[PDB]
Amino acid sequence: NNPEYSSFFGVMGASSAMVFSAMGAAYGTAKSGTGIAAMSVMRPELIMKSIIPVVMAGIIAIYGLVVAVLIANSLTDGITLYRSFLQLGAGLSVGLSGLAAGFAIGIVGDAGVRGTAQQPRLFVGMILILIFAEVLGLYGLIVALILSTK
Amino acid sequence: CCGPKLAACGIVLSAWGVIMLIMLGIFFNVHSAVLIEDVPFTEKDFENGPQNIYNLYEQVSYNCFIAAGLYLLLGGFSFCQVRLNKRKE
Amino acid sequence: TGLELLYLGIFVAFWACMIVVGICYTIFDLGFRFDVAWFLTETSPFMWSNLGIGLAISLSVVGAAWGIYITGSSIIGGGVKAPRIKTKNLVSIIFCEAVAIYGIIMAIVISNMAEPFSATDPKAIGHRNYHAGYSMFGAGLTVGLSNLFCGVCVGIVGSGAALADAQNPSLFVKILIVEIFGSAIGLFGVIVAILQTSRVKMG
Amino acid sequence: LFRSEEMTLAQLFLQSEAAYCCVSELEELGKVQFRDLNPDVNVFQRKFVNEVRRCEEMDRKLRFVEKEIRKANIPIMDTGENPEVPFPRDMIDLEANFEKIENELKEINTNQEALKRNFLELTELKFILRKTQQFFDEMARLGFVAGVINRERIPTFERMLWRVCRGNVFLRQAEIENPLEDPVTGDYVHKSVFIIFFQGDQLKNRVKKICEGFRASLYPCPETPQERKEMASGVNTRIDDLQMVLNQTEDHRQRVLQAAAKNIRVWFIKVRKMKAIYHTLNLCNIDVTQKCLIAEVWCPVTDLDSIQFALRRGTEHSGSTVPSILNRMQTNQTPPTYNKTNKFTHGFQNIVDAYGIGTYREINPAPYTVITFPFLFAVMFGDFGHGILMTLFAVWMVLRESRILSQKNENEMFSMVFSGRYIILLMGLFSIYTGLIYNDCFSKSLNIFGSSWSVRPMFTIGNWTEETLLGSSVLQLNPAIPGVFGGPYPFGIDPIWNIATNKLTFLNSFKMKMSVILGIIHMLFGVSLSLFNHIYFKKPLNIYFGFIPEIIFMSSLFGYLVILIFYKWTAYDAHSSRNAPSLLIHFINMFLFSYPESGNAMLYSGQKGIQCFLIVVAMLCVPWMLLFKPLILRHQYLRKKFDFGDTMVHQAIHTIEYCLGCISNTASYLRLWALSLAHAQLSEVLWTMVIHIGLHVRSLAGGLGLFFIFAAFATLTVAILLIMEGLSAFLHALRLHWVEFQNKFYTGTGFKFLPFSFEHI
Numbered sequence A: 001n002n003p004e005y006s007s008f009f010g011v012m013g014a015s016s017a018m019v020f021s022a023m024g025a026a027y028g029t030a031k032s033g034t035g036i037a038a039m040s041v042m043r044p045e046l047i048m049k050s051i052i053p054v055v056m057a058g059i060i061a062i063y064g065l066v067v068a069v070l071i072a073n074s075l076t077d078g079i080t081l082y083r084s085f086l087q088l089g090a091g092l093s094v095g096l097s098g099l100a101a102g103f104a105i106g107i108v109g110d111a112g113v114r115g116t117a118q119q120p121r122l123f124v125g126m127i128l129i130l131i132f133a134e135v136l137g138l139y140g141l142i143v144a145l146i147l148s149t150k
Numbered sequence B: 001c002c003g004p005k006l007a008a009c010g011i012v013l014s015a016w017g018v019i020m021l022i023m024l025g026i027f028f029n030v031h032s033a034v035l036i037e038d039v040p041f042t043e044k045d046f047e048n049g050p051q052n053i054y055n056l057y058e059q060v061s062y063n064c065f066i067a068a069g070l071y072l073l074l075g076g077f078s079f080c081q082v083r084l085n086k087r088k089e
Numbered sequence C: 001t002g003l004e005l006l007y008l009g010i011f012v013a014f015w016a017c018m019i020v021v022g023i024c025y026t027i028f029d030l031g032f033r034f035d036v037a038w039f040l041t042e043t044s045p046f047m048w049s050n051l052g053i054g055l056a057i058s059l060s061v062v063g064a065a066w067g068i069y070i071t072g073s074s075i076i077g078g079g080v081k082a083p084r085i086k087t088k089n090l091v092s093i094i095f096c097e098a099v100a101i102y103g104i105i106m107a108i109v110i111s112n113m114a115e116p117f118s119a120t121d122p123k124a125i126g127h128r129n130y131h132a133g134y135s136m137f138g139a140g141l142t143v144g145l146s147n148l149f150c151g152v153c154v155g156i157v158g159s160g161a162a163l164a165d166a167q168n169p170s171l172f173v174k175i176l177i178v179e180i181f182g183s184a185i186g187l188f189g190v191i192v193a194i195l196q197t198s199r200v201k202m203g
Numbered sequence D: 001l002f003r004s005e006e007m008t009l010a011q012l013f014l015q016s017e018a019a020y021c022c023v024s025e026l027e028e029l030g031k032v033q034f035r036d037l038n039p040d041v042n043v044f045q046r047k048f049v050n051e052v053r054r055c056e057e058m059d060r061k062l063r064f065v066e067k068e069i070r071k072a073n074i075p076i077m078d079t080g081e082n083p084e085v086p087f088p089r090d091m092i093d094l095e096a097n098f099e100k101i102e103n104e105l106k107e108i109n110t111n112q113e114a115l116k117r118n119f120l121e122l123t124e125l126k127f128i129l130r131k132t133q134q135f136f137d138e139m140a141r142l143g144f145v146a147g148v149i150n151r152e153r154i155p156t157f158e159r160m161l162w163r164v165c166r167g168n169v170f171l172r173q174a175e176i177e178n179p180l181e182d183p184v185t186g187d188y189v190h191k192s193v194f195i196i197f198f199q200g201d202q203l204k205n206r207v208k209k210i211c212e213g214f215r216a217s218l219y220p221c222p223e224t225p226q227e228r229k230e231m232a233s234g235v236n237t238r239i240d241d242l243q244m245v246l247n248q249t250e251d252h253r254q255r256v257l258q259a260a261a262k263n264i265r266v267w268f269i270k271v272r273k274m275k276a277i278y279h280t281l282n283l284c285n286i287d288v289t290q291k292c293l294i295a296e297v298w299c300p301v302t303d304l305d306s307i308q309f310a311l312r313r314g315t316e317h318s319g320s321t322v323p324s325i326l327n328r329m330q331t332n333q334t335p336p337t338y339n340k341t342n343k344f345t346h347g348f349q350n351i352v353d354a355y356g357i358g359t360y361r362e363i364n365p366a367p368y369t370v371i372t373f374p375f376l377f378a379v380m381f382g383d384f385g386h387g388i389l390m391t392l393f394a395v396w397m398v399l400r401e402s403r404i405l406s407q408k409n410e411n412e413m414f415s416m417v418f419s420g421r422y423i424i425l426l427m428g429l430f431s432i433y434t435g436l437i438y439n440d441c442f443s444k445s446l447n448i449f450g451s452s453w454s455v456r457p458m459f460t461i462g463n464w465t466e467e468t469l470l471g472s473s474v475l476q477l478n479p480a481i482p483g484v485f486g487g488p489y490p491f492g493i494d495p496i497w498n499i500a501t502n503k504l505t506f507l508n509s510f511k512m513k514m515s516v517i518l519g520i521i522h523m524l525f526g527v528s529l530s531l532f533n534h535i536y537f538k539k540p541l542n543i544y545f546g547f548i549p550e551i552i553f554m555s556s557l558f559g560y561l562v563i564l565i566f567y568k569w570t571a572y573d574a575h576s577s578r579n580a581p582s583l584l585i586h587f588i589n590m591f592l593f594s595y596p597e598s599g600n601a602m603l604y605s606g607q608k609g610i611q612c613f614l615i616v617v618a619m620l621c622v623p624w625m626l627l628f629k630p631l632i633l634r635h636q637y638l639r640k641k642f643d644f645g646d647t648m649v650h651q652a653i654h655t656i657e658y659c660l661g662c663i664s665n666t667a668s669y670l671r672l673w674a675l676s677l678a679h680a681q682l683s684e685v686l687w688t689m690v691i692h693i694g695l696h697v698r699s700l701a702g703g704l705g706l707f708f709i710f711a712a713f714a715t716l717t718v719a720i721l722l723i724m725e726g727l728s729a730f731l732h733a734l735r736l737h738w739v740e741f742q743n744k745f746y747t748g749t750g751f752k753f754l755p756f757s758f759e760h761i
Helices: A007-039 A052-073 A083-118 A120-147 B004-030 B050-088 C002-027 C036-042 C045-078 C085-092 C094-111 C127-165 C177-196 D018-029 D049-072 D089-139 D151-161 D201-214 D226-283 D304-316 D346-352 D385-399 D401-406 D412-438 D456-461 D503-536 D540-570 D607-625 D630-640 D644-668 D671-694 D699-704 D706-741
Strands: D009-013 D144-150 D191-197 D217-219 D293-298 D324-327
Touching: A007 A052, A007 A083, A007 A120, A052 A083, A052 A120, A052 D671, A052 D706, A083 A120, A083 C045, A120 C045, A120 C085, A120 C094, A120 D412, A120 D503, A120 D671, A120 D706, B004 B050, B004 D706, B050 D699, B050 D706, C045 C085, C045 C094, C045 C127, C085 C094, C085 C127, C085 D706, C094 C127, C094 C177, C094 D644, C127 C177, C177 D644, D018 D226, D018 D304, D049 D089, D049 D226, D089 D144, D089 D191, D089 D217, D089 D226, D144 D151, D144 D201, D151 D191, D151 D201, D201 D217, D226 D293, D304 D324, D346 D412, D346 D706, D385 D401, D385 D412, D385 D706, D401 D412, D503 D540, D503 D644, D503 D671, D503 D706, D540 D607, D540 D644, D607 D644, D630 D644, D644 D706, D671 D706, D699 D706
Parallel strands: none
Antiparallel strands: D009 D293, D009 D324, D144 D191, D144 D217
């Protein structure tokens, strides 16, 4: 007994998993780019030094993309409506996790970019705080993967 | 320009490529059961027997060896360019 | 403020439509049509379970993100003059991150009680299943919301304490108690999340 | 080797004139901190304030000369015999005289710069004249006013000139083709020449007052076309001749500066040594009984003889009465750490040095951990190939470290990588080993010496046969049953688990259980180190009352979980799941940290009693006995003839912090495993998305472009896996170090080392 409209939930799970992570990465990239542009007016040599928040946003987008690709490759015509809700839940979870991670990445990256423009010794400490942001997004990914089976 | 960074990147990428595609070719020649999903498959070969599978395994292996061949070629070209740049000074 | 105006307008319009449709339904002696039981029954419990899991992890992670950024901006601002605070204050940051952890393990436990159904009708097939799905959705919502809110509280307190450390470095130990109180409040949330889904059978 | 290195303090007797020589010799030796003895100085009581002022003036002169040289782009190559000799007092006058001659040359250069500014004003006049040559075409009582004005003031001028009108404004003008750098300001300022034909005398006065308020430099260009050409040619000739003269003079100045760069570098070392000597003398104390000086010195026990050797230099040439005596008292004298004495392995210490251990010989940091530290299990991503790549990079970089340090640095990140090269290489080795045990080489497993499992015994005996095409039509991804099977891989994980689809569940359970066991043993070792740490520092009350409860509670709450995990692993088999087919684990999590009642399921005899006993001994007893502490002595103290409040409140906060932190750090130890799972999935998806596409049929078309696809693979593996995820794990494990691993045995901070190393080259 296969109910109709079953693939709808999985389809929007994949769509949300991609889209929300994309939006979080875009916000992080925009905020960190504004910070870099503000800082570069006085310390030109420190441009490539702290471009890493952009690659962090790229990493969050990569997490979104891999979760979406896995969910889409797991999609079939006859979804038993038990798998579809699992896919939707994992997609929504990872999408909002990526959104929050991008939010923190952008804000802290801008702050740390300004600080390392002002105080050169502050970069490495900022690193720790910034790295924690990615971890949060990472959690979404793992909580999706376990949700891909059970 | 044939900068030192570009030449070094080309050389290291070429070495990376040659070693990896040689090991791919060897693993395809033994026909390990791990890269079976990677190996292309057609439904008409399911009932034919393992002989067709080994034939296409050999074909993709030979593809890998020729790939490593032009990898060695462009690595040698990069080595020649960097050696000429070094000997120019 | 245009976004706030749009949100308020949608809110008030939807609530006015809801109250007017409710009064119309009760006036027209059409109460049986407005069936909450049919909605809670014909709806698949799988959606409730999976939405509960997703919210349980997602609210936790976004509250942790709120806390970590609201404290990291404070740290980086207050650490320009005193670089020594760039790492020593980190003891108040991991809390927020550990708060997010209180979700994922939780998100496992509820997910540990998910089974397929192979059934469609609601008559005598799914009563215990209905209870299990609703209970686990409630537990997931509880842990997610409590964890998010404790994360934002802990981040706020950590930013305050970090700015306090910028002048006298000897008050951090005396001030560490507030954030561990917040983390303990999150622990209460996780505990009741455990207890809610402790005895539930799914199948 | 041992992390004690007792420091101890000493007194340094001196003399009147022998003090300078002895202090310079010790600074050359550089093994003493020289803790200050006179706090109430505030420079006003610095004794040698005039010497410090002379040093400051010399430093300002050197800084100005260096700034001028850098503006001249002249190298400061001063390699060779850099620490020549500490500067004697007499030669300081001659060095200052040479610096004064250099300053006179600089003043002549400044006068030349002023003349150059005048010549640049003449050049601007010449450009406005060049514009006037073309304005005759525009000519064909319009007040002809031409002016030089900054390009930034052009817009507001427009809104500040047309509105007043009173005769209208006809502004026809162009701009200078290049952003003419103004020598008065020195920046590439953007200028323009604005020309207006407004009106006669009244608007002439209006325009003149507008220019006066707006700084615009108006030039009353004449109407006759001849004199402009001759004065423009004359000012151009003057400009070029004077520019040549100034260029020659500054070229002579820079030619002298070629050697003067090394000269002022040596002068910088000399003046820095003199400044350090006088700072130490200010920190030192002067007695009134003699001309001697007494200085408090923080020196190592091993180097004491060398310290005496410095006195041997003192007793030889400058005086004979400058000894040093070990001052063995107990009041204050908080010794510096100075234990960070080691070779390349010192890099490890730097990662530990983010906290500044201090607290004398209690320090027990990197050397105990090194490998078992959360910085060599800082991989959890070993993909065989990734480990070999990291090792290859680090080994090539270590082979080239000679020329790398000899050559100039590239960037601060490269400096950090250079400081970490040793740890990078050894972490690469451990990543190789972790990839081997994980048996995931680029997310593709390795089959070595068998693989276990099979299919024919599972199907023929299990009646699941005749699924050749039926299994490809009816039982898609269905068959997963163990029949007559078993037997683990002799080394790692079977490749069949990799090529399966239940890989996620089995790997998840295995990684979580490995997580629990590794974290529990690690935190147990961390807490156990504190017992030795405290027995070294006497204190039997804390040992027998403060840390025994910690170990008892930690064991009773976590070693039970570890033993349960091992028992579940060992006391079952494939055909032993309770009724249901698999149940996965079904007992790992339902045995929570409280397990109130009921439970059912697995209730092996005695487990209820053991659980209850562990709860009562741990939750009810350990926090209660962790109380009291010094009041127990206070009673005896109260029977003999301490602030109770602060002591008990601090003890209470520490106890609640530790009891909550046991659970918190047990949960937080789960972090690196998320990185492990994410890295595995990232590698697998990257493979299945790029390489799986790149290897297909039609060999010619399937391999002609294989070069580009494989180069993309290499770039992606380097970028997101090797560096990005590598850095993520790198810092994750350091956090696991600094939150729970090392925050168990060592606590506190202390002053680091500070000798006279002549860090200024």
